[PDB]
Design a protein around this ligand. Structure first.
Ligand SMILES: CCCCCCCCO[C@@H]1O[C@H](CO)[C@@H](O)[C@H](O)[C@H]1O
Ligand SMILES: CCCCCCCCO[C@@H]1O[C@H](CO)[C@@H](O)[C@H](O)[C@H]1O
Ligand SMILES: CCCCCCCCO[C@@H]1O[C@H](CO)[C@@H](O)[C@H](O)[C@H]1O
Ligand SMILES: CCCCCCCCO[C@@H]1O[C@H](CO)[C@@H](O)[C@H](O)[C@H]1O
Ligand SMILES: CCCCCCCCO[C@@H]1O[C@H](CO)[C@@H](O)[C@H](O)[C@H]1O
Ligand SMILES: CCCCCCCCO[C@@H]1O[C@H](CO)[C@@H](O)[C@H](O)[C@H]1O
Ligand SMILES: CCCCCCCCO[C@@H]1O[C@H](CO)[C@@H](O)[C@H](O)[C@H]1O
Ligand SMILES: CCCCCCCCO[C@@H]1O[C@H](CO)[C@@H](O)[C@H](O)[C@H]1O
Ligand SMILES: CCCCCCCCO[C@@H]1O[C@H](CO)[C@@H](O)[C@H](O)[C@H]1O
Lengths: 455, 455, 455
């Protein structure tokens, strides 16, 4: 039999729909092709990024450990499943003992002997009330949870590799922008030095140009270091070296991702890996509850063997030395100071803990997807405003430069316009990077890229 | 008996008083009503924040798991306490075996049988030297440590909910400030466009106003996203949806907290939950030391039953088939290659580890409270200086605007004054948020809000 | 015998040499004195920092726990090593039972008794196929891994203490710079107030000076708090109070560290502690594999004792009551539904997990050392550019001040120059701190300071 209680999946303690407001667009509703089914080969349009994600999937050591844990829990489940059948082996027993007079069968001190070679099982637990079967089902649910954990680990690895790639590309763009601005500042400083050496353009302008040049140089060194360290982080995430014949990657100013649907919050209960991991852990706790109650009921043991026995060692395997033993045992606990009841309470408490953790996983998934949706709703406006800011700063800088080539305006306003333009372009690169990272993390939260191609 | 060593609480490896310096006010000394006794209903003056903290206490899943762990460790302690009494059950045993001639009692191959149904205990460990009792005391101290951990978890949850609430309110204030500044910039840009279309006010001023407008727009989008995500984080911390009929909350510019006394560092040894958790873990290690030494002394086992026995199955429960078994056993370890000594060394080492962890908990509490006191000592001056900076920036902006409505000054100085005022107000909001968060974290470090009302 | 497989250290899945590029200098190659052998007494030139690192090594509680874990794992290994030898003890057994007629030797209900006091071993497992020896070797490798973990913990503690010291010193430098700039701003504001009260210098300049003063005041309060909290963090890392008679420390503008060689990436396989920890864990998993396969082969048990036995209690220790028991047992598993095979699969999977974790430790070490090398290659240029920026800002500020003491220029340009100089000096202090922290972390990654003096 089985004393495992019925499993009822708890209600999702989240809102029926994703949040709405000044930062959220209209709820799209139920999705035909959910986010978890959109393969990462189609979500990420950059072919070099796709090849890097493949190299990471095949070489990342953390994902390797996450995949091997599934094998380990499968082996543990197979052990627990084997625990049901009798362990049949060959038992070779010998006994030789001296007994005093009052204990020996002859009345005087005597040396008795007894030898046996038998085949059979010792203390086999007949699982009549489903204790070992409940433990086996618990192990099976823990294995399924480990499999879901491996899927979640793959989604996390894909998201992290994409984030590292985009961060390296953004820092390379920043480094190139700093190169260009430093070259412009150095050209301007050389012209101002030529002017200063012939009495024109006071030291003030020369010192101003020198400050600009040195600031650009420091930023150049900083961004060089950042690019090198981003490459290091990408190599670490890949688990292997960067291939030499990578395809041509797409720039930040291009469409890098396919817009992924949000779906309903109920899609997380069936599509997000860690939620299913928590659910399988809950079902494992349920099976453990079953195993714990199986302890109140009678336990049945069987010791059964057949073979040869003799008083002499020379009498072993002789005709007529055959023997067999059949020993059933039934035990029924009557008084366990509170012990079985406390164990059952512990099992119930563990199931409640898994319920709470499953509910919190649902809530965390909801929060992360809602943050991703807020990012999707606001980053378009923020990037458009930053585009317009960079454009207007460029127009202002061009007007100041045209009013400076004519004696109209001075050098300080021109340098201020240059600095504002540089900072605006930096912030534009940063906002692009943040938008892309937010979309990648939303893709990971909705279901990730467990599938390579769209199913 | 009991071989558990005496417990002596280690001296607090911290200073007798909290640090003093340019950032710390005068030490208040011993507090009449300590910080841990001040309820969170009285520490937090915002009624909406109080209702949110209540909803979080009743719905947060992490606190639910922390409370269920106390139940689980209570069940484990009850199991260990039950382990002391004999496990009395009904044993039904059967035996049927064929023996060869030289081993059977008849001289020829014979099939012997034996059946019994008895009531009693098997291998009951008479806890004469306090091994099981020491294990039970270890389980009890671990349960008390779990209870202290639940209290610490509640304090952490209260602090986190308050921090999320204050962060959401501060970002909403930032969003409103950005709305106002963007409206001002748009009005100014429209006036400058009207002027530019009639020959007055050169393109330079128009491009300047456009840059200001676009920057304000980007900041607006950013703060909208931040407010949405802060609401998401608050909802996650609550474990439930935000109620609709919440009371009227207080603004950041109002008195939100009651100033909490610092007390002496010795108050942490009796009022902070995680320190008591570490202390209970240490006492559990002490009881484990007792259980480990109980192994060198003689162990006593008892197998005692009474019931019916027979050679035939039909002879069971017949008159005259009564039987009883009394089997005492005493074992004394003589030679254990180093095994018992190494186990005792392991127990002593575990107690030393718990001592070190208790001392480090004390030190961490001291460091956190000292950081909170430095924040209390410096944030008043910083906020006053920021108030005066915002005031002087407003005066400068008004003077520039009055010198711009008259042809006196130009547009660039006015826009620079506006930008400085906006940044000063942003920094004022940020400093208010940081002061409030520091005070909340100091309240959590001193003892938290385990009590709802002041005891 | 021993069924443990051969151990082959996996190839390092990292590049043969450290990365090269615009941020990396030329690879130095194999180092005569590797980084791990350079003692921290010689790496850190600040004598006060050396004394603080010593106080931390002697008083930090985390390092104390890391050292006690080595003792605990040594005790566990000693237990596993003791498990090989027979446990010889004194067994005192008594038996008194009533048997019915059909089971007693007299044909009628009879009370039989039997007492014995013997010395010997019970169920001693003759480790013929190396199961207990494999478990002992696994425990030994886990102990060696714990020792390597203690070494890694010491390196981490040294790096953290150095980082805290340098951060406190940098924030103190920032606080002094803010003091000086605030004093200058207050002097200028007092002069501007004197001027304004006599009709000279319009309110605009007065409000400008007031804004500067208030900003400097707020920054002063902030840096005071930061210095106090850095001192708190240093005290926490030390595990004890700061000594009063510390030696004279060196300033940030001095040479604080000795340039440490990078060596080859192959040096990490023999010099970095956590990599050796992972390797010892892998060898422990190998020994566990050996123990798991030892289960397929015959197990041998021995129950052997000698002492006195009698039917009466008065017959104990009487002449002629001597007795001895020799009971060998041999078991050979024949049918284990998949159980032994699944356990062996689990052992192999655990060894593969340890292989993957060892490889990932190697990769992480490579990434951290490469980041340190990029920092070493770029921070010199960045600090030189920041030096030149501070110098040019000082020259520009002096020119503006000389053009302001003469009626030439106004107050706004002078204040802007002052603000730029202050920010440049702040960034210089920050860049110095970051360079020093990067070099300290590179020293920790290459091998740390496990040795006090250079070996
Ligand atoms: C011979 C049958 C004796 C059964 C005695 C059961 C003693 C009470 O044990 C009960 O067993 C249940 C399992 O079905 C548990 O779920 C209950 O919580 C527990 O109280
Ligand atoms: C090592 C040699 C052990 C030999 O054991 C022998 O076994 C015989 C069994 O018949 C006995 O008769 C002998 O007394 C005994 O010495
Ligand atoms: C020789 C002892 C005979 C059995 C008497 C043991 C009585 C133990 O009493 C036990 O106390 C616990 C709480 O204290 C309860 O939870 C248990 O239900 C109860 O059995
Ligand atoms: C019959 C009594 C025999 C007792 C032999 C004890 C062997 C030495 O064992 C001792 O036991 C102590 C427990 O009291 C431990 O605390 C000691 O550290 C341990 O060395
Ligand atoms: C399944 C049927 C097992 C029947 O078992 C019977 O038990 C009897 C006990 O007296 C023996 O006499 C018989 O030999 C035996 O077959
Ligand atoms: C058949 C074996 C008879 C017993 C002899 C076993 C001797 C084991 O010697 C053991 O070595 C350990 C360290 O090596 C010590 O810590 C133990 O105190 C010591 O008993
Ligand atoms: C009496 C000897 C019987 C040995 C039967 C071994 C059954 C197969 O067991 C084998 O044992 C090996 C250990 O050497 C393992 O490494 C193998 O993977 C396992 O398949
Ligand atoms: C408590 C007192 C237990 C006394 O036990 C006695 O042991 C004797 C052994 O010869 C028996 O003869 C007695 O029947 C029995 O009562
Ligand atoms: C009374 C039962 C007699 C023994 C028959 C038990 C048959 C169990 O079959 C087992 O199934 C497993 C997978 O399902 C396999 O891995 C095992 O190799 C196999 O032994």
């Amino acid at each position: 039999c089985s004393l495992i209680p019925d499993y009822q999946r708890p209600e999702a303690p989240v809102a029926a729909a994703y949040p709405q407001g000044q930062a959220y667009g209209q709820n799209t509703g139920a999705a035909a092709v959910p986010a978890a089914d959109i393969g990462w080969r189609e979500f990420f349009r950059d072919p070099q990024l796709q090849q890097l994600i493949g190299v990471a999937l095949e070489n990342n050591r953390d994902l390797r450990v996450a995949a091997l844990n599934v094998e380990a829990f499968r082996a543990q489940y197979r052990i627990q499943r084997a625990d049901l059948f009798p362990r049949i082996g060959v038992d070779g027993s010998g006994t030789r003992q001296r007994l005093p007079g009052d204990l020996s069968t002859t009345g005087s001190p005597a040396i008795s002997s007894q030898y046996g070679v038998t085949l059979g099982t010792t203390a086999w637990e007949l699982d009549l009330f489903g204790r070992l079967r409940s433990l086996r089902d618990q192990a099976l649910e823990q294995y399924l949870a480990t499999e879901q954990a491996q899927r979640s680990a793959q989604t996390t690895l894909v998201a992290s590799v994409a984030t590292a790639y985009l961060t390296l590309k953004a820092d390379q763009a920043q480094l190139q922008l700093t190169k260009d601005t430093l070259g412009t500042y150095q050209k301007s400083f050389d012209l101002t030095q030529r002017s200063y050496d012939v009495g024109v353009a006071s030291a003030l302008d020369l010192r101003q140009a020198q400050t600009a040049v040195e600031g650009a140089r420091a930023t150049l060194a900083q961004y060089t270091r950042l690019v090198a360290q981003d490459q290091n982080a990408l190599v670490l995430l890949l688990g292997s070296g960067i291939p030499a014949n990578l395809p041509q990657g797409l720039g930040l100013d291009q469409t890098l991702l396919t817009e992924v649907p949000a779906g309903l919050p109920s899609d997380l209960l069936q599509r997000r890996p860690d939620i299913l991991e928590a659910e399988h852990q809950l079902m494992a706790a349920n099976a453990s509850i079953g195993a714990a109650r199986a302890a109140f009921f009678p336990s049945i043991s069987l010791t059964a063997n057949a073979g040869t026995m003799s008083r002499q060692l020379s009498g072993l395997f002789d005709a007529g030395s055959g023997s067999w033993l059949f020993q059933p045992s039934i035990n029924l606990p009557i008084f366990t100071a509170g012990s079985l009841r406390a164990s059952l309470d512990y099992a119930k408490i563990q199931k409640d803990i898994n319920v709470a953790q499953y509910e919190k996983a649902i809530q965390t998934a909801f929060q992360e997807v809602a943050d991703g949706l807020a990012a999707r709703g606001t980053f378009t406006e923020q990037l458009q405003a930053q585009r317009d800011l960079v454009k207007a700063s460029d127009e202002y800088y061009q007007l100041a430069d045209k009013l400076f080539r004519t004696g109209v305006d001075n050098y300080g306003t021109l340098l201020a316009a240059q600095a504002s333009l540089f900072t605006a372009q930096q912030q534009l690169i940063t906002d692009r990077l943040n938008q892309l990272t937010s979309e990648v993390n939303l893709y990971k939260a909705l279901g990730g890229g467990w599938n390579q191609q769209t199913v």
